[PDB]
Amino acid sequence: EIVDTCSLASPASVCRTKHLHLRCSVDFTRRTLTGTAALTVQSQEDNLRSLVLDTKDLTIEKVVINGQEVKYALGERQSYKGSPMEISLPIALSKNQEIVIEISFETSPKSSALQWLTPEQTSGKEHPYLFSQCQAIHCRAILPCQDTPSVKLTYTAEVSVPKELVALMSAIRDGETPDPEDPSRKIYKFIQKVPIPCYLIALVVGALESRQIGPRTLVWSEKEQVEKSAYEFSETESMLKIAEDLGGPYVWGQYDLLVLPPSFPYGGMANPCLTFVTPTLLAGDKSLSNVIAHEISHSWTGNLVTNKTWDHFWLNEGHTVYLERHICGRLFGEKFRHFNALGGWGELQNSVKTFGETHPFTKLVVDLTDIDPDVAYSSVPYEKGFALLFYLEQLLGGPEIFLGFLKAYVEKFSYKSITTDDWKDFLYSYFKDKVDVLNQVDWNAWLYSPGLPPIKPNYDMTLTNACIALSQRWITAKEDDLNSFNATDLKDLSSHQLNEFLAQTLQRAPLPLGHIKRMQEVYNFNAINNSEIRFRWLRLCIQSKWEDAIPLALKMATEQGRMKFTRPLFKDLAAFDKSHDQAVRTYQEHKASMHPVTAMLVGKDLKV
Amino acid sequence: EIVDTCSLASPASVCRTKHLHLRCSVDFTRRTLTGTAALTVQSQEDNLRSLVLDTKDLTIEKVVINGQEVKYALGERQSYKGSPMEISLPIALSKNQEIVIEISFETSPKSSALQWLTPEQTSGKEHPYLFSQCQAIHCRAILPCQDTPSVKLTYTAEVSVPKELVALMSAIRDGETPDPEDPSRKIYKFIQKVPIPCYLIALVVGALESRQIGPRTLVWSEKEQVEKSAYEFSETESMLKIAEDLGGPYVWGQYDLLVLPPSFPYGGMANPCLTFVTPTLLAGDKSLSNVIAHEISHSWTGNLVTNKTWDHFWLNEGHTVYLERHICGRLFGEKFRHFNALGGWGELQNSVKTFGETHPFTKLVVDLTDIDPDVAYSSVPYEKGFALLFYLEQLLGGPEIFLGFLKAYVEKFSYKSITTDDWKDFLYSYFKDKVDVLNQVDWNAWLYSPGLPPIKPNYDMTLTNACIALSQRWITAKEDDLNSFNATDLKDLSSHQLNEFLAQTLQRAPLPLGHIKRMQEVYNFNAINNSEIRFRWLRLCIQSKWEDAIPLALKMATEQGRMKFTRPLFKDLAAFDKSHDQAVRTYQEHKASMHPVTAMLVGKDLKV
Amino acid sequence: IVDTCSLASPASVCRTKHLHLRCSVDFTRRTLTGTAALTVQSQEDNLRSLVLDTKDLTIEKVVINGQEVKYALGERQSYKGSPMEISLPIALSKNQEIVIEISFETSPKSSALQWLTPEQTSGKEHPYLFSQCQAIHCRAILPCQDTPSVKLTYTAEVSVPKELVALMSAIRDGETPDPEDPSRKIYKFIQKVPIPCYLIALVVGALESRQIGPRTLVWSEKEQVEKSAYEFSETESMLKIAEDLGGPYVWGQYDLLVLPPSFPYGGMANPCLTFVTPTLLAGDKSLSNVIAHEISHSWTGNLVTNKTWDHFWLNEGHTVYLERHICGRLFGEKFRHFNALGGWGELQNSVKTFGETHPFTKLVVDLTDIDPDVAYSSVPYEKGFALLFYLEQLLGGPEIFLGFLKAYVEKFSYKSITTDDWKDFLYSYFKDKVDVLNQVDWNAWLYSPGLPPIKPNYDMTLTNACIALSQRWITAKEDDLNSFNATDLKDLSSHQLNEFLAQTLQRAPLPLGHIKRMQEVYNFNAINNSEIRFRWLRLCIQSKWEDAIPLALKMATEQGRMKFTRPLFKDLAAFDKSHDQAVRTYQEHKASMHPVTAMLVGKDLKV
Ligand SMILES: CCCCC/C=C\C\C=C/C=C/C=C/[C@@H]1O[C@H]1CCCC(=O)O
Ligand SMILES: CCCCC/C=C\C\C=C/C=C/C=C/[C@@H]1O[C@H]1CCCC(=O)O
Ligand SMILES: CCCCC/C=C\C\C=C/C=C/C=C/[C@@H]1O[C@H]1CCCC(=O)O
Ligand SMILES: [Zn+2]
Ligand SMILES: [Zn+2]
Ligand SMILES: [Zn+2]
């Protein structure tokens, strides 16, 4: 009934991959991954004679079944979807019959899933570095697979690397041995016994060291960042404990963190057993830990209960933002949960404004037919999804009651892949005594209409009031008022409130260039290295036509690669007449060394 | 007085679109139409402060009036009717005041008006293909409009396409030029000076070539079908001359023919200046040219005199079938007109039997409140409408007298949209001297009752007798009579009589399996490629439980897409237990690549 | 005699004896859906088909003896609707009966119904529905012989959202949860007295009740229920008087329902459940003559019924006659004459408006090709009353003539009759006074347009002070305006204030300075008595006082009684200063107005 319009492989209704055994070697002299993917596949129908896998820029050497090579054909490339690989089975399979297909392959150096870093691009300057990023549909650029989240497989893996480096994966570490075929190399083994969608497969190889920060958590990075990260993320275990109370047991064994080089495109990636995080989280005061609570929460919403197709991405992210903000509310107070919730509604405003209130990507449930998931990615599924759940919480009796539903929903669909209708049907089942309340929800509008939601939740304003007051003072200030502003204006404002003040002001950009110059004089925002504050501050300066900020904005856009920051900065710099040429030139000069997905999207943003 | 319950736009009594200037670009990479629709709108009332247009899956970037963006709101989607779009006018308009509203829009890849074909889906295999089909209410899935046949507008268009392709529209071709903004593209221009309902807007883009077959007729298709099409439709100009004698002057300038890919859902579509036709008319002997005569006749009944709402659809089709059969009668004789007339009564019997004799869709005048016109569509308005006109012909003095009425009717309502009451009132006015005769008509049953009409016209039987004789012989035959059947049974039967023989036999299906095998043995109907004969033959085989015909019926049902054939073949295959599962699997495997309307209806027929 | 307002088979062909209505009220789609089971009796041999009235109904199927039958919906005949011809399975002989079960659904545009959103009600939480079938709108609810010549009993089962209450023109016969939908409730009703179908009535809404007499509950939304119980406290005393005058009350219950402000009439005497406008809520019981009028229909109209609408005056003339006797008993014969004379004034106004040769000023009208809603006026009420009042005084006074009235009701109870029936019985009851009767100009009274040929005699006691004050204002000049004072009113009842304004309105326009002075000394703006405020605002508008424009527009739209709304809209359209805003206001409100009021105001405003 449900079709994954982003995958070219045979659907789960035809056959299902139950297990992957990956045996590969990481070759830094050629920037390629070579090896074998052994897929244990189960037919779901009688007379299954062939099957199709996803691939993208993969070189296929051979396909072996039962010791014999078999016929296969790579179809024509379908742009961002890659090339379908049809495999002719030696004998037709019947329903429930299993077979192991071993595919020998190597990746392209331009694999959209991988970034290869030269030693000069690392912190240590002596060794190279490799990291993967498979979500949404880049796993097919590492290895042939049914690249759809409707299929969940276990996996084991054997990875040969230069013996001076360390390999980690989204799995439990299963030992290391010198490579018997090459004394300069080492083999690291991994095992993942919880079934996962293949977009949760992850690999990192580099000069990595670790620091233990909890009974089940090591923080990993290059030696220059390991201690700073252990401090920054010291709250991890306390958040895991809260998450388990809200979601039920943590089933993944280990919860390690990996702090990647600055070019990592996202704030985090909840790869099971090994969350990847951006080093732009290292604010020095733990103030960006909500990203950690987010990735922790995916250990339930996303990794355990999984969207069946990317049309239903909001199930993954909406519920994860909801759990994230409950974690931070437990740690810092209910008024802080509402502050962050209200801030999230503002980011939704921004996203709808950027797309347009009729744009299809502002629907909660999207149709990705002929759409690249990376192009459609936005805050909408996060924050319109959260807004729906927060609204339902307030409609159905408050946080305690709704968290009861959330825990039961996770238990109901653990280890499965589901759709919006699965979720809604269960909501109605769990709240069968409040069906008349549920039936007052404008379901069509919430789930399927573009634009802002048909109703806005209620938000405590306690921590937001001071932000609104200071922003309005600046917005409505005249020349005769600029002298009244003083560093003391920020006396009782947390970093979170400074960030919100700037977010509110940015929504009403541009300000008079004289206001921005004063703001720097009395507040010295140029000295703040908190990445969220500096991002919004530099966007404010650029959109308000301050030439002094051009080099600072260019520096931040290129010295880190978190798309949340890099794309809007390049976009603002391109729209500023005095920095347009520099923005395009800087992009062209850096795009070879950028992450492949970020490089593509920035290129698209700049129209080059 | 009359309400169009298929449209959400402001009605013609509130405001009227007088002109459309369409400027758009066709993007085969994204499967989108992007551009601007400039609507010249005339208010019909004082103090008009806003108006509503139909849309369906359109992204509305902005709305500009007098060089300034205006406020607009997209309402909730109402399933098959789309989403209404309310525009707040900058200044209230009084009666007769006109404004130009320029709407920037983008279609969805899932536009129900469009089918996008990949190169592999075309005849040439090297280029992609796009064609539209707006009737009844799909124009709103291409551009914002008052999507109601009660409004008639002229239009001009500018269409940008890849330079390797050709664009055509339901309009006079107005030149081509390289696209100034993109050397990879061309711009084709079009002019329609005759006011049309928006359902007659049509666009095709593909690798099209042409042959001239008359002073005002080019036949268009991919190169592989051009010449065969020019032969098949050589009678076009002679049919236009006859039609002009029956209906008055042809006002549209050009009468071009476009032969579409096999997935075109209808036998023809009478888009002004450019009739669309199915390639299943390519029988090799011109025997299916009544479809051409039908589309030609729409140049008067339908395109010039238009039904005001789709409840009065029979005005379009009943009169068009009436003219169609007069054209073919002029070319091939009055006995042949009666032959086709009687065959059409047979098709009415089939339609009433399928719906049931009390179904509201067997009424001549229908009520489509909350009904999707694509679901209600049937041959009832065609054949009950024709039957009413044929009955009246015979009642009022015969064909020469009634053709005089028809010509005066066309002249009276030319360029207008009308109801059944307008028609009937003018019938009484034209036949002032026969009011007592008209008052004998059972108008209440003819117009508003379901089932077969209250009275059957008189039909010459000359050409039908041999078909009845042979059908009866096969129906009443026993196993010992089978050897007497012989190929010489067919020696004096035309293709039309073969077709009617199968139709009469199909009305009494199933036949014994042994009878059907014998029929193939002596007549070799498997060898016949005439789409009408093959369709009825395979239905007979499937309904008579002949397993050998399963792959043939599945082949025809999927290798072309004319709904007249595809839907009943899938239905028959679904009802045959031996082919049920394969019918369903085949639909599921192809539905992504099917026409959107055909896919929806076959999915409904199959109950998936 | 033919009913030119009905397309159904007439009573001489077949007669509906009983209706069993089983329906469901859908507020989402604004439809009534269900089955109308008609028990029909043939009046002729070889009856093989029959025709029913319908208007904007969707017919799903027609069932007789458990089998679907053939039927045909015919061409629409504008306000008359569409005829529905049913083919009977076997021919019927004289007196044979069949039950015909018709599955139907109403249109949201049904001219019989107004659907109200929650915002349009007092409570704001629940929707509301009410019907109004008189004269020929029952055919827009269900198929029927929509003619008062046919009288039927009925039973009904109505399913509604369980939070709402349903009432009908019938005895309440219990309630129960809907066995097929737990969110709904089924209300049952039984009407054992045969009625013409224009007396079928339905209301559904958030209704509450207060008992104000042994056989009277007053129903409304909670916001109005106690104020209405006070306003109409005289109901039982009026019922007792009406029973003395007309004979027994045969209907069982006499409940009252106070509708939302859009109800188009002052009242509608639906049996067992009189509907009234909330504009009767004056706060002092002063508009209770409307209750007396609806009570009186329990005899003249509901028990003795006009055979066709050409004879509407039989219903309304006698009902006004009874109305004014009830109020005369309660408040004195001088008050009866006061009300009678005012009614003559309203007849004057109506005949002047129509014109003295207008066919709608005949007592007996010919409604061929005429929409009854368009012909409706005060002529049948007040010309009918004037005829009976004249005859009263001609034949020996009220005591004698009330003797005729009681014998007339008894003679024709449960029947439908014509003017000739009434006149023949008059001549029979007054055998000894035939010479007196033969002095009456019957052709003038019954069949000629314009004002009656003779005016009755009226006591002037309560009217004199009204005329004196009005003339003082009409003939006053500048030097007289300062002599007017609030004390001018100290001895005038509300009824006399209203009559003073009516007298003054007849002579409109008055000078603008006069109207300004009148508000200064009398403060008529503060009076909320709807009759008084209506005439006051008409006076202000016709006298060109721009300050009254917002007040008149407010009254015209915040309530919907056609007696007030239509003349306020017409006056506003006749005032150049208010014309545009009046048309604009109507266009902005018409979608939310009652369908009949919307049609008529639209016609009045030539939109
Ligand atoms: C409704 C459209 C569905 C399209 C789904 C398409 C793409 C998803 C691809 C990559 C997602 C990476 C998600 C990472 C953790 O939730 C993200 C928080 C990181 C945001 C940031 O702080 O930069
Ligand atoms: C009684 C009203 C029913 C509602 C249907 C309204 C619109 C129907 C929608 C699309 C109609 C396309 C008609 C095309 C040419 O006249 C048709 C002949 C082609 C039929 C065939 O041979 O496949
Ligand atoms: C002389 C025949 C003309 C055709 C008129 C026949 C029927 C008109 C249709 C509806 C009549 C409803 C009457 C209701 C109550 O007796 C009326 C008192 C209410 C008037 C008011 O005070 O607003
Ligand atoms: Zn996430
Ligand atoms: Zn046609
Ligand atoms: Zn009355």
mmCIF file of all heavy atoms in Angstrom, chain A residues 419-430:
data_model
loop_
_atom_site.group_PDB
_atom_site.id
_atom_site.type_symbol
_atom_site.label_atom_id
_atom_site.label_comp_id
_atom_site.label_asym_id
_atom_site.label_seq_id
_atom_site.Cartn_x
_atom_site.Cartn_y
_atom_site.Cartn_z
ATOM 1 N N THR A 419 3.746 4.338 9.458
ATOM 2 C CA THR A 419 3.259 5.500 8.738
ATOM 3 C C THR A 419 2.465 6.404 9.671
ATOM 4 O O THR A 419 2.128 6.046 10.806
ATOM 5 C CB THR A 419 2.362 5.089 7.566
ATOM 6 O OG1 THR A 419 1.125 4.586 8.080
ATOM 7 C CG2 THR A 419 3.037 4.032 6.722
ATOM 8 N N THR A 420 2.145 7.592 9.154
ATOM 9 C CA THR A 420 1.328 8.533 9.905
ATOM 10 C C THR A 420 0.003 7.899 10.311
ATOM 11 O O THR A 420 -0.476 8.113 11.429
ATOM 12 C CB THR A 420 1.091 9.797 9.074
ATOM 13 O OG1 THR A 420 2.331 10.505 8.906
ATOM 14 C CG2 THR A 420 0.083 10.709 9.744
ATOM 15 N N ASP A 421 -0.602 7.112 9.416
ATOM 16 C CA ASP A 421 -1.863 6.451 9.741
ATOM 17 C C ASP A 421 -1.692 5.415 10.844
ATOM 18 O O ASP A 421 -2.604 5.228 11.656
ATOM 19 C CB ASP A 421 -2.452 5.795 8.492
ATOM 20 C CG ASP A 421 -3.232 6.772 7.632
ATOM 21 O OD1 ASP A 421 -3.819 7.724 8.194
ATOM 22 O OD2 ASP A 421 -3.254 6.585 6.397
ATOM 23 N N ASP A 422 -0.549 4.726 10.886
ATOM 24 C CA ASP A 422 -0.266 3.849 12.019
ATOM 25 C C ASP A 422 -0.262 4.643 13.316
ATOM 26 O O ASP A 422 -0.871 4.242 14.317
ATOM 27 C CB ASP A 422 1.078 3.141 11.822
ATOM 28 C CG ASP A 422 1.048 2.114 10.694
ATOM 29 O OD1 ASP A 422 0.017 1.440 10.534
ATOM 30 O OD2 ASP A 422 2.051 1.990 9.967
ATOM 31 N N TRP A 423 0.433 5.776 13.317
ATOM 32 C CA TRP A 423 0.510 6.606 14.512
ATOM 33 C C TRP A 423 -0.875 7.113 14.900
ATOM 34 O O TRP A 423 -1.312 6.956 16.047
ATOM 35 C CB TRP A 423 1.490 7.755 14.260
ATOM 36 C CG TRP A 423 1.478 8.834 15.286
ATOM 37 C CD1 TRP A 423 2.226 8.902 16.423
ATOM 38 C CD2 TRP A 423 0.669 10.008 15.265
ATOM 39 N NE1 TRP A 423 1.931 10.047 17.113
ATOM 40 C CE2 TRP A 423 0.975 10.746 16.421
ATOM 41 C CE3 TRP A 423 -0.286 10.506 14.379
ATOM 42 C CZ2 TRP A 423 0.355 11.955 16.717
ATOM 43 C CZ3 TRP A 423 -0.898 11.707 14.672
ATOM 44 C CH2 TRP A 423 -0.577 12.416 15.831
ATOM 45 N N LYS A 424 -1.603 7.685 13.938
ATOM 46 C CA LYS A 424 -2.912 8.254 14.239
ATOM 47 C C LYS A 424 -3.879 7.187 14.740
ATOM 48 O O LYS A 424 -4.619 7.412 15.708
ATOM 49 C CB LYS A 424 -3.478 8.952 13.001
ATOM 50 C CG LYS A 424 -4.812 9.636 13.239
ATOM 51 C CD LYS A 424 -5.420 10.136 11.941
ATOM 52 C CE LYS A 424 -6.835 10.656 12.160
ATOM 53 N NZ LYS A 424 -7.521 10.971 10.881
ATOM 54 N N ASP A 425 -3.903 6.028 14.078
ATOM 55 C CA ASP A 425 -4.772 4.946 14.519
ATOM 56 C C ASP A 425 -4.454 4.547 15.950
ATOM 57 O O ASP A 425 -5.361 4.244 16.731
ATOM 58 C CB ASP A 425 -4.630 3.736 13.595
ATOM 59 C CG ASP A 425 -5.268 3.953 12.237
ATOM 60 O OD1 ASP A 425 -6.099 4.871 12.099
ATOM 61 O OD2 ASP A 425 -4.938 3.195 11.304
ATOM 62 N N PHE A 426 -3.171 4.545 16.317
ATOM 63 C CA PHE A 426 -2.824 4.161 17.680
ATOM 64 C C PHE A 426 -3.178 5.262 18.671
ATOM 65 O O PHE A 426 -3.601 4.976 19.798
ATOM 66 C CB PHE A 426 -1.343 3.806 17.797
ATOM 67 C CG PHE A 426 -0.955 3.397 19.190
ATOM 68 C CD1 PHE A 426 -1.368 2.178 19.700
ATOM 69 C CD2 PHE A 426 -0.227 4.243 20.003
ATOM 70 C CE1 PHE A 426 -1.040 1.800 20.988
ATOM 71 C CE2 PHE A 426 0.106 3.872 21.295
ATOM 72 C CZ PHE A 426 -0.300 2.653 21.788
ATOM 73 N N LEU A 427 -3.000 6.524 18.273
ATOM 74 C CA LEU A 427 -3.447 7.640 19.104
ATOM 75 C C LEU A 427 -4.913 7.467 19.476
ATOM 76 O O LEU A 427 -5.291 7.563 20.649
ATOM 77 C CB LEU A 427 -3.232 8.963 18.359
ATOM 78 C CG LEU A 427 -3.614 10.250 19.091
ATOM 79 C CD1 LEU A 427 -2.593 10.544 20.173
ATOM 80 C CD2 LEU A 427 -3.733 11.419 18.133
ATOM 81 N N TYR A 428 -5.748 7.188 18.474
ATOM 82 C CA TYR A 428 -7.174 6.995 18.710
ATOM 83 C C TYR A 428 -7.431 5.766 19.574
ATOM 84 O O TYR A 428 -8.344 5.766 20.409
ATOM 85 C CB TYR A 428 -7.901 6.884 17.371
ATOM 86 C CG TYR A 428 -8.447 8.197 16.858
ATOM 87 C CD1 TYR A 428 -7.615 9.143 16.265
ATOM 88 C CD2 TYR A 428 -9.803 8.494 16.970
ATOM 89 C CE1 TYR A 428 -8.116 10.344 15.800
ATOM 90 C CE2 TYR A 428 -10.316 9.691 16.508
ATOM 91 C CZ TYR A 428 -9.470 10.613 15.925
ATOM 92 O OH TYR A 428 -9.981 11.802 15.468
ATOM 93 N N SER A 429 -6.630 4.715 19.401
ATOM 94 C CA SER A 429 -6.798 3.517 20.217
ATOM 95 C C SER A 429 -6.398 3.777 21.665
ATOM 96 O O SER A 429 -7.130 3.423 22.598
ATOM 97 C CB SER A 429 -5.980 2.366 19.639
ATOM 98 O OG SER A 429 -6.001 1.266 20.527
ATOM 99 N N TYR A 430 -5.239 4.403 21.873
ATOM 100 C CA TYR A 430 -4.793 4.688 23.230
ATOM 101 C C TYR A 430 -5.747 5.644 23.939
ATOM 102 O O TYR A 430 -6.026 5.480 25.131
ATOM 103 C CB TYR A 430 -3.381 5.269 23.204
ATOM 104 C CG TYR A 430 -2.821 5.522 24.581
ATOM 105 C CD1 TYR A 430 -2.039 4.575 25.212
ATOM 106 C CD2 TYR A 430 -3.084 6.706 25.252
ATOM 107 C CE1 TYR A 430 -1.520 4.795 26.477
ATOM 108 C CE2 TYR A 430 -2.574 6.939 26.524
ATOM 109 C CZ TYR A 430 -1.791 5.977 27.128
ATOM 110 O OH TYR A 430 -1.280 6.193 28.382
#
